[PDB]
Every structure is written in C-alpha cells, then in structure tokens.
PDB file of C-alpha atoms in Angstrom:
ATOM      1  CA  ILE A 125      26.358  72.562   8.039  1.00  0.00           C
ATOM      2  CA  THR A 126      23.797  74.759   9.743  1.00  0.00           C
ATOM      3  CA  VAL A 127      23.220  71.979  12.246  1.00  0.00           C
ATOM      4  CA  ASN A 128      26.841  72.277  13.202  1.00  0.00           C
ATOM      5  CA  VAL A 129      26.555  76.039  13.279  1.00  0.00           C
ATOM      6  CA  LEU A 130      23.614  76.048  15.635  1.00  0.00           C
ATOM      7  CA  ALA A 131      25.478  73.743  17.951  1.00  0.00           C
ATOM      8  CA  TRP A 132      28.413  76.083  17.845  1.00  0.00           C
ATOM      9  CA  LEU A 133      26.135  78.967  18.680  1.00  0.00           C
ATOM     10  CA  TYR A 134      24.813  76.985  21.593  1.00  0.00           C
ATOM     11  CA  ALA A 135      28.376  76.477  22.690  1.00  0.00           C
ATOM     12  CA  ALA A 136      28.752  80.213  22.430  1.00  0.00           C
ATOM     13  CA  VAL A 137      25.839  80.652  24.797  1.00  0.00           C
ATOM     14  CA  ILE A 138      27.454  78.180  27.152  1.00  0.00           C
ATOM     15  CA  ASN A 139      30.621  80.192  26.871  1.00  0.00           C
ATOM     16  CA  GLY A 140      28.726  83.314  27.727  1.00  0.00           C
ATOM     17  CA  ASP A 141      28.796  85.049  24.398  1.00  0.00           C
ATOM     18  CA  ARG A 142      25.490  86.784  24.310  1.00  0.00           C
ATOM     19  CA  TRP A 143      25.750  89.912  22.201  1.00  0.00           C
ATOM     20  CA  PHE A 144      24.712  87.988  19.137  1.00  0.00           C
ATOM     21  CA  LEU A 145      21.418  87.051  20.724  1.00  0.00           C
ATOM     22  CA  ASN A 146      18.404  89.077  19.759  1.00  0.00           C
ATOM     23  CA  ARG A 147      14.805  89.130  20.847  1.00  0.00           C
ATOM     24  CA  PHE A 148      13.464  88.239  17.443  1.00  0.00           C
ATOM     25  CA  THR A 149      11.997  84.997  16.264  1.00  0.00           C
ATOM     26  CA  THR A 150      11.716  83.181  12.988  1.00  0.00           C
ATOM     27  CA  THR A 151       9.944  80.257  11.417  1.00  0.00           C
ATOM     28  CA  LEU A 152      11.700  77.213  10.095  1.00  0.00           C
ATOM     29  CA  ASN A 153      10.235  77.882   6.678  1.00  0.00           C
ATOM     30  CA  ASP A 154      11.458  81.447   6.694  1.00  0.00           C
ATOM     31  CA  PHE A 155      14.836  80.399   7.961  1.00  0.00           C
ATOM     32  CA  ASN A 156      15.313  77.756   5.312  1.00  0.00           C
ATOM     33  CA  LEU A 157      14.645  80.348   2.625  1.00  0.00           C
ATOM     34  CA  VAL A 158      17.440  82.499   3.951  1.00  0.00           C
ATOM     35  CA  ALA A 159      19.694  79.478   4.359  1.00  0.00           C
ATOM     36  CA  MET A 160      19.108  78.390   0.787  1.00  0.00           C
ATOM     37  CA  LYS A 161      20.146  81.787  -0.478  1.00  0.00           C
ATOM     38  CA  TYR A 162      23.465  81.554   1.312  1.00  0.00           C
ATOM     39  CA  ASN A 163      24.088  77.921   0.382  1.00  0.00           C
ATOM     40  CA  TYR A 164      23.451  76.751   3.895  1.00  0.00           C
ATOM     41  CA  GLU A 165      21.934  73.336   4.319  1.00  0.00           C
ATOM     42  CA  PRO A 166      18.370  73.472   5.603  1.00  0.00           C
ATOM     43  CA  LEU A 167      17.489  72.859   9.207  1.00  0.00           C
ATOM     44  CA  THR A 168      15.091  69.969   9.553  1.00  0.00           C
ATOM     45  CA  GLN A 169      12.942  69.017  12.500  1.00  0.00           C
ATOM     46  CA  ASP A 170      15.181  66.011  12.823  1.00  0.00           C
ATOM     47  CA  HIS A 171      18.040  68.290  13.713  1.00  0.00           C
ATOM     48  CA  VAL A 172      15.731  70.425  15.773  1.00  0.00           C
ATOM     49  CA  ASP A 173      15.247  67.282  17.801  1.00  0.00           C
ATOM     50  CA  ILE A 174      18.980  66.811  17.759  1.00  0.00           C
ATOM     51  CA  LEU A 175      19.373  70.271  19.109  1.00  0.00           C
ATOM     52  CA  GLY A 176      16.543  69.832  21.610  1.00  0.00           C
ATOM     53  CA  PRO A 177      18.816  68.954  24.544  1.00  0.00           C
ATOM     54  CA  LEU A 178      21.008  71.904  23.720  1.00  0.00           C
ATOM     55  CA  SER A 179      17.908  74.043  23.696  1.00  0.00           C
ATOM     56  CA  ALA A 180      17.157  72.609  27.087  1.00  0.00           C
ATOM     57  CA  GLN A 181      20.544  73.580  28.420  1.00  0.00           C
ATOM     58  CA  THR A 182      20.617  77.114  27.184  1.00  0.00           C
ATOM     59  CA  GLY A 183      16.950  77.885  27.437  1.00  0.00           C
ATOM     60  CA  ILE A 184      17.177  79.183  23.905  1.00  0.00           C
ATOM     61  CA  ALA A 185      14.628  77.969  21.406  1.00  0.00           C
ATOM     62  CA  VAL A 186      16.081  76.423  18.277  1.00  0.00           C
ATOM     63  CA  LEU A 187      14.066  78.827  16.187  1.00  0.00           C
ATOM     64  CA  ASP A 188      15.352  81.692  18.260  1.00  0.00           C
ATOM     65  CA  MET A 189      18.856  80.468  17.555  1.00  0.00           C
ATOM     66  CA  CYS A 190      17.843  80.349  13.937  1.00  0.00           C
ATOM     67  CA  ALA A 191      16.520  83.856  14.047  1.00  0.00           C
ATOM     68  CA  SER A 192      19.651  85.293  15.579  1.00  0.00           C
ATOM     69  CA  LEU A 193      21.584  83.292  13.014  1.00  0.00           C
ATOM     70  CA  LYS A 194      19.427  84.885  10.368  1.00  0.00           C
ATOM     71  CA  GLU A 195      20.505  88.344  11.420  1.00  0.00           C
ATOM     72  CA  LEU A 196      24.094  87.170  11.552  1.00  0.00           C
ATOM     73  CA  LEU A 197      23.927  85.909   8.025  1.00  0.00           C
ATOM     74  CA  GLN A 198      22.138  88.870   6.614  1.00  0.00           C
ATOM     75  CA  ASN A 199      24.159  91.640   8.197  1.00  0.00           C
ATOM     76  CA  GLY A 200      27.352  89.757   8.800  1.00  0.00           C
ATOM     77  CA  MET A 201      29.269  89.762  12.029  1.00  0.00           C
ATOM     78  CA  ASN A 202      30.151  93.398  11.565  1.00  0.00           C
ATOM     79  CA  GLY A 203      33.797  92.822  12.298  1.00  0.00           C
ATOM     80  CA  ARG A 204      32.884  91.155  15.563  1.00  0.00           C
ATOM     81  CA  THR A 205      34.233  87.804  16.635  1.00  0.00           C
ATOM     82  CA  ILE A 206      32.531  84.933  18.356  1.00  0.00           C
ATOM     83  CA  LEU A 207      34.585  82.515  20.405  1.00  0.00           C
ATOM     84  CA  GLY A 208      37.625  84.356  19.131  1.00  0.00           C
ATOM     85  CA  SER A 209      36.723  83.341  15.587  1.00  0.00           C
ATOM     86  CA  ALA A 210      36.007  85.790  12.885  1.00  0.00           C
ATOM     87  CA  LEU A 211      34.298  83.030  10.967  1.00  0.00           C
ATOM     88  CA  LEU A 212      31.138  81.237  11.842  1.00  0.00           C
ATOM     89  CA  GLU A 213      32.305  77.829  12.926  1.00  0.00           C
ATOM     90  CA  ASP A 214      30.575  74.872  11.361  1.00  0.00           C
ATOM     91  CA  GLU A 215      33.178  72.280  12.218  1.00  0.00           C
ATOM     92  CA  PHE A 216      31.694  71.197  15.528  1.00  0.00           C
ATOM     93  CA  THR A 217      28.958  68.651  15.513  1.00  0.00           C
ATOM     94  CA  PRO A 218      26.231  68.934  18.161  1.00  0.00           C
ATOM     95  CA  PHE A 219      27.510  65.775  19.722  1.00  0.00           C
ATOM     96  CA  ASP A 220      30.952  67.275  20.118  1.00  0.00           C
ATOM     97  CA  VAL A 221      29.491  70.403  21.655  1.00  0.00           C
ATOM     98  CA  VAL A 222      27.384  68.305  23.960  1.00  0.00           C
ATOM     99  CA  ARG A 223      30.339  66.192  24.994  1.00  0.00           C
ATOM    100  CA  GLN A 224      32.476  69.133  25.937  1.00  0.00           C
ATOM    101  CA  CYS A 225      29.819  71.307  27.425  1.00  0.00           C
ATOM    102  CA  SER A 226      27.226  69.094  29.053  1.00  0.00           C
ATOM    103  CA  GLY A 227      29.670  67.231  31.209  1.00  0.00           C
ATOM    104  CA  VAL A 228      28.384  63.701  31.395  1.00  0.00           C
ATOM    105  CA  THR A 229      25.790  62.812  28.821  1.00  0.00           C
ATOM    106  CA  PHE A 230      23.393  60.027  29.586  1.00  0.00           C
ATOM    107  CA  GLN A 231      22.389  57.593  26.913  1.00  0.00           C
TER     108      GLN A 231
END
C-alpha cells in the first residue's frame, strides 16, 4: 500500500531521517508506471489529498515523496535502514502516522 508507504516516509521525515530525500521530482503518471512494475498500488489524487496535511507538516510535496520513493524502489535501500527497518514499512496508515506525529488532530 503505497499510500501507507508515503505516510511512513512522512513519519520518517518527522523522525528526522533525511538521507533518503533527494532533490528530484516526478509526475504521478510516471510514478504509477514504476509502481505498477513493482506491484505497488497506484497513488491516486484521492490519497494525495489524504496525504495533503502530511505534506503540510513536512513541507515535502507528495510528488517529491513519490520521486524519492521512486529512487528507493529502483535502486533499493542499498543496505541502509530507515526507522531501524531494513524493509519499507507499509503497515502504517496515514491516519496512524498523523495520530502519533501531529499531536492533536482537529476534525
């Protein structure tokens, strides 16, 4: 669940992991092509809008998250770990990330 992954990445930013960021950018269309290859679910604008608040927090564009993700997928993590995991974590929903890492969330 890419949508979970992006949230997790946002958590990573909150947690101060930063090496995995890059200064590149991507398009949703381009991203989805890469995702499809790797049997990742596509990111839709719906989930962009889900991730909007998280983008607000971290100042990182969703597409920029996608781009950095793209590099991560293509080249792998190169033995590196993120949040002490050697595996890209897709277990955490955006809501969970938001709950833990945005303090009090308004409705």
